[PDB]
Amino acid sequence: MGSSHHHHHHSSGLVPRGSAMGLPNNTASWFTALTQHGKEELRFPRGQGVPINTNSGPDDQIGYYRRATRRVRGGDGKMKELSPRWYFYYLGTGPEASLPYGANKEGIVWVATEGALNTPKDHIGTRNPNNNAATVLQLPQGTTLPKGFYAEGSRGGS
């Protein structure tokens, strides 16, 4: 004490203890999710498949969407059940780029750009409450939605 103060090192608990993280360190969701209400699953039409994106893949605009199902306790003990939606998961090389690139699944919809070249560029998908909101995808002119699907959302008004 007095002069030269060291970090928070009481020197009582040797054990590291990461406050039981088990959650996204600093990544919430730097993007939106296509809410599917129809009777089908996500699967953007031909042409591109994946939104315009921002910088989650220079020459490797590939990836997939993970069907996210959130629940909300409406009223006093009610269940509204948040509108089902799939969150975008950019993919290329710089970032994870570990997956098999097209690992077909049940609640997962894979999609690759018109010929992924594979390039370095990782620095997204981390909407840490302090950095910035989510760029939220924006399908090009076409790339419409399947049977009865609702675009990412894009809340009109930040």
From Swiss-Prot:
Q: Which residues cross the membrane?
A: none
GO MF terms listed in the record are: DNA binding; identical protein binding; molecular adaptor activity; RNA binding
Quick one: where is this thing mainly located?
Answer: virion
Asked if the Swiss-Prot or TrEMBL record annotates the protein with the keyword Phosphoprotein, the reply is yes
UniProt GO BP:
negative regulation of interferon-beta production; viral RNA genome packaging
As stated in the Swiss-Prot or TrEMBL entry, residues carrying the post-translational modification Phosphoserine are S154
Chain intervals for the UniProt region annotation (RNA-binding): 22-158, 22-158
> What's one GO-annotated cellular component?
viral nucleocapsid
The record gives the effect of mutating T27I as: In strain: Isolate Frankfurt 1 and Isolate FRA
- CoV N NTD domain location is 26-153
Enumerate the UniProt keywords alphabetically: ADP-ribosylation, Host cytoplasm, Host Golgi apparatus, Host nucleus, Host-virus interaction, Phosphoprotein, Ribonucleoprotein, RNA-binding, Transcription, Transcription regulation, Viral nucleoprotein, Virion
Where along this sequence does the record place binding of RNA?
A: R70, R85, R127
Entry's localization field? Virion; Host endoplasmic reticulum-Golgi intermediate compartment; Host Golgi apparatus; Host cytoplasm, Host perinuclear region
Post-translational modification as stated in the protein's UniProt record: Proteolytically cleaved by host CASP6. The cleavage leads to two fragments and facilitates viral replication by inhibiting host IFN signaling. The two fragments may interact with IRF3 inhibiting its nuclear translocation after activation and reduce the expression of IFNB and IFN-stimulated genes.
Residues folding into a coiled coil are none
The job of this chain, per UniProt, is described as: Packages the positive strand viral genome RNA into a helical ribonucleocapsid (RNP) and plays a fundamental role during virion assembly through its interactions with the viral genome and membrane protein M. Plays an important role in enhancing the efficiency of subgenomic viral RNA transcription as well as viral replication. May modulate transforming growth factor-beta signaling by binding host SMAD3.
Q: How does it assemble?
A: Homooligomer. Both monomeric and oligomeric forms interact with RNA. Interacts with protein M. Interacts with protein E. May bind to host HNRNPA1. Interacts with NSP3; this interaction serves to tether the genome to the newly translated replicase-transcriptase complex at a very early stage of infection. May interact with host SMAD3. Interacts with host PPIA/CYPA.
**Family, per the entry?**
Belongs to the betacoronavirus nucleocapsid protein family.
- What is the official name of this protein in its record? Nucleoprotein
Traced from the root, the source organism's taxonomic lineage reads: Viruses, Riboviria, Orthornavirae, Pisuviricota, Pisoniviricetes
